[PDB]
């Protein structure tokens, strides 16, 4: 635990988890369900908010920047994999703006 990881858990994750556009990101991408047989060929480090949440709950992270990189990977995966016109891209962008706004007020340490 750091004060920063606390803030990521209580402020950042809280605000994104309950957001109306969060639902595609709450669990790992299931490439079979979604009919995306090339997903895991393109995206080599899958990430999702449930995994990040579990990691915060279980004190997996050593530093805030580690959890921040996982959020980033999650969004980046979406931008890389999806078509520019896919609605999921706009959902991701919306959530990432919240993430950045909240991170701008995270404490030092």
UniProtKB/Swiss-Prot annotation:
It comes from Homo sapiens (Human). It is found in: Nucleus; Chromosome. Some specific inhibitors of BRD2 that prevent binding to acetylated histone are promising therapeutic molecules for the treatment of cancers or inflammatory diseases. ABBV-744, a small molecule, has been tested on tumors with success: ABBV-744 antiproliferative activity is mainly restricted to cell lines of acute myeloid leukaemia and prostate cancer and is able to displace BRD4 from chromatin. GSK046 (iBET-BD2), which specifically inhibits the second bromo domain, is a promising therapeutic small molecule for the treatment of inflammatory and autoimmune diseases. A protein binds at residues 38, 81-83, 86-87. The lineage of its organism: Eukaryota, Metazoa, Chordata, Craniata, Vertebrata. The chain holds residues 75 to 183 of 801 of the full protein. Changing residue 108 to A: Partial loss of homodimerization. Changing residue 80 to A: Partial loss of homodimerization. Abolished binding to histone H4 acetylated at 'Lys-12' (H4K12ac). This is Bromodomain-containing protein 2. Changing residue 103 to E: Loss of homodimerization.
């Amino acid at each position: 635990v750091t004060n920063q990881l606390q803030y990521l858990h209580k402020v950042v994750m809280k605000a994104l988890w309950k957001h109306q556009f969060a639902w595609p990101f709450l669990q790992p991408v299931d490439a079979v369900k979604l009919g995306l047989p090339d997903y895991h060929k393109i995206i080599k480090q899958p990430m999702d908010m449930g995994t990040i949440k579990r990691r915060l709950e279980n004190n997996y992270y050593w530093a805030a920047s580690e959890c921040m990189q996982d959020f980033n990977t999650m969004f980046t995966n979406c931008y890389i994999y999806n078509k520019p016109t896919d609605d999921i891209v706009l959902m991701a962008q919306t959530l990432e703006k919240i993430f950045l706004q909240k991170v701008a007020s995270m404490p030092q340490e």
